[PDB]
Amino acid sequence: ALLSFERKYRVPGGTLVGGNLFDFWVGPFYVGFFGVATFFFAALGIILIAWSAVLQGTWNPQLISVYPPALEYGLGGAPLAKGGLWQIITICATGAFVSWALREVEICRKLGIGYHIPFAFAFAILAYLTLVLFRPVMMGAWGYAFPYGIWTHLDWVSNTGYTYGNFHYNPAHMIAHTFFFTNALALALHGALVLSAANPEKGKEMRTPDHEDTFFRDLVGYSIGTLGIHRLGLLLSLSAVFFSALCMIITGTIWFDQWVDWWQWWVKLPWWANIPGGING
Amino acid sequence: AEYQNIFTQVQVRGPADLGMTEDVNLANRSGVGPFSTLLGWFGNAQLGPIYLGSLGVLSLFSGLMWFFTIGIWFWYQAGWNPAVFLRDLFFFSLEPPAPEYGLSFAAPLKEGGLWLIASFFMFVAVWSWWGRTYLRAQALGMGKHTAWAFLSAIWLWMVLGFIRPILMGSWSEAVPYGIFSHLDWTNNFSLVHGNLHYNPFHGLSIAFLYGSALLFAMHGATILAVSRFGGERELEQIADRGTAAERAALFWRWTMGFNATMEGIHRWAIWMAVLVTLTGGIGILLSGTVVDNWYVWGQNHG
Amino acid sequence: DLASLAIYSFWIFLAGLIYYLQTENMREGYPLENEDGTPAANQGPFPLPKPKTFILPHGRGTLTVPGPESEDRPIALARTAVSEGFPHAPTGDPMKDGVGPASWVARRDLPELDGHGHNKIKPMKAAAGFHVSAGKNPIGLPVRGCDLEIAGKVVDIWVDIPEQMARFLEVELKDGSTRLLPMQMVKVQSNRVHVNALSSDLFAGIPTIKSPTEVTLLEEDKICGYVAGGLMYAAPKRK
Numbered sequence: 001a002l003l004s005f006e007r008k009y010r011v012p013g014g015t016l017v018g019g020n021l022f023d024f025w026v027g028p029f030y031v032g033f034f035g036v037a038t039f040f041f042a043a044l045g046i047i048l049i050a051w052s053a054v055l056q057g058t059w060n061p062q063l064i065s066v067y068p069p070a071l072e073y074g075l076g077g078a079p080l081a082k083g084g085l086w087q088i089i090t091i092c093a094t095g096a097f098v099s100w101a102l103r104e105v106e107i108c109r110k111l112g113i114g115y116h117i118p119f120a121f122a123f124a125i126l127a128y129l130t131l132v133l134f135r136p137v138m139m140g141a142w143g144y145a146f147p148y149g150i151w152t153h154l155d156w157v158s159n160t161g162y163t164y165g166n167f168h169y170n171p172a173h174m175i176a177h178t179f180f181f182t183n184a185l186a187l188a189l190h191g192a193l194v195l196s197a198a199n200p201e202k203g204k205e206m207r208t209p210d211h212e213d214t215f216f217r218d219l220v221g222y223s224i225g226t227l228g229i230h231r232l233g234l235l236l237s238l239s240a241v242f243f244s245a246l247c248m249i250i251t252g253t254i255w256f257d258q259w260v261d262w263w264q265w266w267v268k269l270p271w272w273a274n275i276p277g278g279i280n281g
Numbered sequence: 282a283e284y285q286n287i288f289t290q291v292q293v294r295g296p297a298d299l300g301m302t303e304d305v306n307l308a309n310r311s312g313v314g315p316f317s318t319l320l321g322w323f324g325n326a327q328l329g330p331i332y333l334g335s336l337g338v339l340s341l342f343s344g345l346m347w348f349f350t351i352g353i354w355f356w357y358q359a360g361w362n363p364a365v366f367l368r369d370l371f372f373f374s375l376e377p378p379a380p381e382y383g384l385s386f387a388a389p390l391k392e393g394g395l396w397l398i399a400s401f402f403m404f405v406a407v408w409s410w411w412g413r414t415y416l417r418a419q420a421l422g423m424g425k426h427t428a429w430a431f432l433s434a435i436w437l438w439m440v441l442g443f444i445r446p447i448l449m450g451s452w453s454e455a456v457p458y459g460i461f462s463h464l465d466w467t468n469n470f471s472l473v474h475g476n477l478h479y480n481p482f483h484g485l486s487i488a489f490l491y492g493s494a495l496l497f498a499m500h501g502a503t504i505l506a507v508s509r510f511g512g513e514r515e516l517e518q519i520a521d522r523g524t525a526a527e528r529a530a531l532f533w534r535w536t537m538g539f540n541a542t543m544e545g546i547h548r549w550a551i552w553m554a555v556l557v558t559l560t561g562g563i564g565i566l567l568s569g570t571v572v573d574n575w576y577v578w579g580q581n582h583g
Numbered sequence: 584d585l586a587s588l589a590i591y592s593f594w595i596f597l598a599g600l601i602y603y604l605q606t607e608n609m610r611e612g613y614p615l616e617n618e619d620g621t622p623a624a625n626q627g628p629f630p631l632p633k634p635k636t637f638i639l640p641h642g643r644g645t646l647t648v649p650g651p652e653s654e655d656r657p658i659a660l661a662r663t664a665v666s667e668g669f670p671h672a673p674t675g676d677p678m679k680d681g682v683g684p685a686s687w688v689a690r691r692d693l694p695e696l697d698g699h700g701h702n703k704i705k706p707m708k709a710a711a712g713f714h715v716s717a718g719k720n721p722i723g724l725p726v727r728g729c730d731l732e733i734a735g736k737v738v739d740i741w742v743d744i745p746e747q748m749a750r751f752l753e754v755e756l757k758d759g760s761t762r763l764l765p766m767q768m769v770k771v772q773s774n775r776v777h778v779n780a781l782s783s784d785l786f787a788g789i790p791t792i793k794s795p796t797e798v799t800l801l802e803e804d805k806i807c808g809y810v811a812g813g814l815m816y817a818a819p820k821r822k
């Protein structure tokens with residue numbers, strides 16, 4: 001089926017591969033070549049996960065886990081039952097994500113809009129590839145990557161972090177955390193601002209962006225504007241993920257001690273290292 | 282290549298915009314500040330005006346009182362030596378009363394009496410500021426969504442510093458005012474309760490937190506992608522849908538099989554974000570009051 | 584156990600909320616339709632919400648959604664297949680007909696008003712006190728199309744007065760008439776403005792506006808639609 005206004009936009013064209021061959025929909029879903037790619041990769045990966053489940057011996061979402069090859073295997077293959085499945089599933093997953101983004105590009109071209117959405121998605125994809133590919137390879141083993149299971153990958157976050165003490169002290173992770181929390185704050189405000197203007201007091205008229213600017217200036221003395229708030233939400237979000245990937249790309253590679261000790265470079269600065277008093281004197 | 286609308290190419294300025302008046306007491310509105318051309322490359326260049334009624338000055342005053350009360354204690358921890366004050370800036374901490382003093386206000390000032398003082402100023406400043414978010418919307422005839430969302434963040438903060446200390450019987454449970462010290466508080470809170478990763482409300486908080494970065498990435502990218510049809514003029518696209526709103530909806534429908542409206546997306550947005558601190562506050566509130574170990578609880582309840 | 588009760592309750596509340604949010608997002612484009620315009624059999628598992636009504640300011644009326652839904656325009660497309668789900672070929676010139684990436688919506692043929700009832704968007708010449716304040720001022724620059732030929736010259740900027748931003752460049756063509764180009768679709772360079780969406784020969788076909796000092800929502804959608812459609816539709820013949 002189609003929305004009221006949809007048919008005028010369902011024209012040929014936009015594809016990057018295959019010409020008219022996969023230029024069609026399935027219900028609401030656009031296909032394209034990269035829809036087929038996504039389906040193949042995703043279906044393969046899911047099948048392998050269900051297979052890796054019988055080798056483990058459980059069909060329970062909260063127990064199915066697919067661990068990478070152990071550190072003994074370095075950066076080479078491993079028997080399927082012992083981390084080859086994880087490796088090929090990782091290839092499927094990279095395959096499906098990259099396909100999904102390229103499928104979004106084709107939708108972008110058919111609709112005459114900018115490419116901002118798959119570009120933004122590519123930041124998430126690179127965070128994933130940091131954990132499963134870039135950092136493992138820089139560290140010499142696939143075993144440093146996280147397992148694919150609901151609770152076991154949480155255990156991996158905890159064990160990886162505590163390997164460096166309290167992980168809060170990773171300074172890139174400190175910046176990332178700030179962008180995540182700022183982003184949520186911006187999201188709550190933006191959503192509440194537009195809705196407070198579109199849904200004013202009972203019986204009143206629908207307010208204007210002018211009211212939206214006025215409201216925030218009244219409140220904080222500034223208003224970023226309706227174009228700016230969308231620039232902002234995108235920038236906070238992608239920066240959060242960038243500094244996420246950055247905080248882990250540097251951990252276990254250029255820095256591998258307790259992150260709390262990294263901060264001693266500040267306190268042991270010559271002009272104040274040895275003054276008495278304070279917490280470190 | 283194509284222009285991406287991330288940064289303005291040509292700024293234009295006109296007379297300083299003093300804003301809608303509606304029912305606002307204009308006597309309490311300042312005059313406009315300067316114009317930041319720097320800001321103008323990303324958002325608005327105009328600073329000010331700001332409204333500052335009595336509730337306004339109250340909030341602002343107790344906020345700095347909270348802040349100076351901490352910084353006073355930080356100087357004394359530095360023995361008034363400016364060089365150590367900077368050197369140890371992230372290590373100073375204004376700690377709450379020890380468990381001995383319970384919920385009382387009897388503790389000496391250098392043993393949590395000062396914490397309670399700064400906390401009082403914080404309490405006053407936040408709650409008055411909350412009233413400001415309601416009142417400034419009322420004066421303009423707008424909905425109360427902003428104050429309602431703000432309440433959700435206030436929820437967690439209230440739980441961390443007030444409701445949960447009270448339910449646990451002592452101020453010692455509350456968060457200390459300090460950079461590194463409250464990070465440590467966070468880590469030790471998790472260890473003491475058997476790993477918050479097993480708190481189901483903590484997991485939900487993360488899903489909404491991650492989700493907010495997902496949704497605002499999606500949303501912000503979508504509006505930029507259709508800003509070549511005026512997409513960011515959202516209120517008028519709500520009142521009279523344009524090709525911008527239709528291409529936006531259809532991108533997502535074609536991608537994931539369903540889509541939003543120009544208004545509805547903002548309801549997804551406000552809820553994604555406010556559920557972060559809503560589930561968050563619940564999960565903290567339950568910790569040590571009802572559940573002492575989230576691993577243990579997880580063994581019996583799922 | 585209280586925590587078990589709280590989390591079970593929350594999952595129920597979260598399902599009601601998602602249901603609520605999904606229905607709220609069906610106030611446009613629903614009911615679903617077949618490609619021929621009739622109601623589709625399968626509408627999904629979510630019902631239409633009870634209508635709501637927005638009170639527009641400045642006597643502009645109201646909007647009630649969901650409501651009866653019509654494109655309120657002819658659509659020059661035809662099926663390319665004998666079953667559902669394939670593309671629909673333009674029966675004419677797709678940029679002239681306003682289909683595909685060249686599509687426009689029959690928005691109200693009035694201009695958008697600010698909070699004081701005045702037109703949101705004015706050419707800068709008619710905007711008291713408005714001037715270029717940073718970046719290269721485009722007024723006077725030649726405008727170059729994607730075929731690398733000059734199609735015109737910038738003669739003003741059309742500015743959003745309440746938000747104080749540039750929204751269109753007004754470009755004058757060889758014949759002395761002007762067009763509006765969306766600001767978001769030009770690249771202001773030091774010696775020119777570059778428009779990659781249109782070749783020089785398609786500039787004359789940009790929809791024109793009826794009054795030289797305002798632009799209506801309907802006119803903006805035709806201009807924006809047309810220019811954006813050039814990305815797919817100019818690319819063959821020129822680049």
Ligand code: BCL
Pocket residue numbers: 046049128131146150151153154157478483484485487488489491492495
């Ligand atoms: C991001 C930094 C860390 C990490 C740290 C944490 C922590 C800490 C927590 C989670 C939590 C979750 N994480 Mg994790 N997580 C990582 C990487 C991933 C990846 C990935 C491929 O890169 C995926 C798919 C997930 C998925 C998940 C969900 C099971 C859950 C809620 C996420 C959410 O709402 O996100 C925002 C996104 C949305 C709202 C959109 C919808 C996303 C849906 C829910 C994802 C479903 C995944 C599905 C179960 C996977 C199998 C797919 C099928 C095989 C096809 N994580 C890395 C290693 N993640 C939480 C939890 O409760 O876990 C038990 C939690 O507390």
Ligand code: BCL
Pocket residue numbers: 157181407434435437438441466467468469470471476477478480482483486487490557558560561562564565
């Ligand atoms: C070792 C650390 C522990 C752990 C311990 C805790 C503890 C303890 C808590 C969290 C909390 C949170 N954690 Mg955890 N957390 C861990 C692992 C993680 C991981 C991960 C990758 O594994 C992630 C992604 C998270 C993420 C999160 C968030 C979802 C959540 C906070 C919501 C929020 O925004 O609060 C921030 C928002 C607020 C505090 C509200 C602020 C509102 C007030 C009103 C603002 C006042 C401003 C003031 C006046 C100053 C003004 C200055 C201005 C400039 C003027 N945690 C591990 C297992 N985490 C919190 C939570 O909710 O848990 C359920 C919490 O308390």
Ligand SMILES: C/C=C1/c2cc3[nH]c4c(c3C)C(=O)[C@H](C(=O)OC)c4c3nc(cc4[nH]c(cc(n2)[C@@H]1C)c(C(C)=O)c4C)[C@@H](C)[C@@H]3CCC(=O)OC/C=C(\C)CCC[C@H](C)CCC[C@H](C)CCCC(C)C
Pocket residue numbers: 038041042043045046049089092093096097100104117118120121122123124147148149150151153237238241491492494495498499502536537
């Ligand atoms: C960069 C800023 C943010 C950002 C941004 C954006 N995010 C986007 C877009 C943008 C802009 C899109 O355009 C796109 C989309 O359409 O949205 C609706 C997308 C999407 N973001 C998803 C998940 C998501 N985003 C997260 C984070 C952020 N996103 C950050 C914060 C997180 C976490 C953990 O935080 C999650 C879980 C999907 C919903 C969706 C891809 C679907 C897909 O690619 O389908 C194609 C693939 C499949 C249908 C399944 C493939 C199955 C494999 C082969 C088998 C499984 C392998 C796997 C490794 C197993 C893991 C188990 C688990 C327990 C560990």
Ligand SMILES: C/C=C1/c2cc3[nH]c4c(c3C)C(=O)[C@H](C(=O)OC)c4c3nc(cc4[nH]c(cc(n2)[C@@H]1C)c(C(C)=O)c4C)[C@@H](C)[C@@H]3CCC(=O)OC/C=C(\C)CCC[C@H](C)CCC[C@H](C)CCCC(C)C
Pocket residue numbers: 181182184185188189219220340341342343344345348406407408410411414427428430431432433434554555556557558
């Ligand atoms: C999920 C829900 C999200 C969310 C939601 C919402 N959050 C809101 C609203 C909503 C909806 C509002 O409506 C309201 C507001 O109006 O927004 C513009 C507000 C707010 N959320 C603030 C901070 C915050 N939210 C956080 C969290 C989330 N919130 C989560 C993620 C976090 C953390 C830790 O994560 C923080 C730090 C303030 C900006 C503001 C309160 C001001 C106050 O109560 O002031 C009272 C204090 C004062 C008036 C003065 C205090 C003096 C200061 C220290 C200044 C000294 C300056 C010095 C001289 C110079 C240098 C500066 C240097 C120190 C830097």
Ligand SMILES: COC(C)(C)C(=O)C/C=C(\C)CC/C=C(\C)CC/C=C(\C)CCCC/C(C)=C/CC[C@H](C)CC/C=C(\C)CCC=C(C)C
Pocket residue numbers: 348349350351352353355356397398400401403404438439440441442443456457458459460463
């Ligand atoms: C240059 O130096 C000068 C002196 C000028 C300065 O002023 C420098 C200032 C500083 C250096 C200040 C630095 C400030 C910080 C480092 C702030 C750090 C604070 C945090 C990290 C906050 C963590 C979370 C805080 C929380 C959760 C607070 C909760 C507060 C409660 C909800 C309040 C409840 C009230 C109480 C308990 C008091 C009793 C209640 C009544 C109602 C009476």
Ligand SMILES: CCCCCCCCCCCC[N+](C)(C)[O-]
Pocket residue numbers: 016098101102105115118119122
């Ligand atoms: C992982 C994909 C990232 C999204 C990329 C966004 C910009 C892509 C531009 C595509 C143009 C392709 N081409 C060569 C046909 O023009």
Ligand SMILES: CCCCCCCCCCCC[N+](C)(C)[O-]
Pocket residue numbers: 220221222311312313314315328329330331
């Ligand atoms: C969150 C960003 C806050 C920006 C604050 C801007 C302060 C308001 C400026 C008021 C100017 C008053 N004065 C003296 C110039 O007239």
Ligand SMILES: CCCCCCCCCCCC[N+](C)(C)[O-]
Pocket residue numbers: 480481482484485488489492549552553
């Ligand atoms: C309003 C958007 C709704 C987003 C849906 C969030 C999915 C939650 C999955 C996280 C699971 C958390 N838990 C309790 C199992 O730990």
Ligand SMILES: CCCCCCCCCCCC[N+](C)(C)[O-]
Pocket residue numbers: 027028537538539627
């Ligand atoms: C949080 C769990 C993620 C589940 C993904 C849900 C995607 C639903 C897409 C539904 C659209 C398909 N259809 C035919 C029903 O329209």
Ligand SMILES: CCCCCCCCCCCC[N+](C)(C)[O-]
Pocket residue numbers: 448449566567569570571
């Ligand atoms: C969601 C409600 C949270 C609190 C419910 C009642 C518990 C109050 C605290 C009592 C128990 C605390 N303590 C110290 C005995 O563990």
Ligand SMILES: CCCCCCCCCCCC[N+](C)(C)[O-]
Pocket residue numbers: 538539540601605626627628629
């Ligand atoms: C965490 C996000 C939850 C997404 C919820 C899934 C919604 C899919 C149903 C959309 C209905 C599409 N339909 C049939 C009405 O067109």
Ligand SMILES: [Cl-]
Pocket residue numbers: 548
């Ligand atoms: Cl809502």
Ligand SMILES: [Fe+3]
Pocket residue numbers: 190194230500504515547
């Ligand atoms: Fe928006």
Ligand SMILES: [K+]
Pocket residue numbers: 473474475573574
């Ligand atoms: K315990």
Ligand SMILES: [K+]
Pocket residue numbers: 707708709710711712713714
């Ligand atoms: K002028």
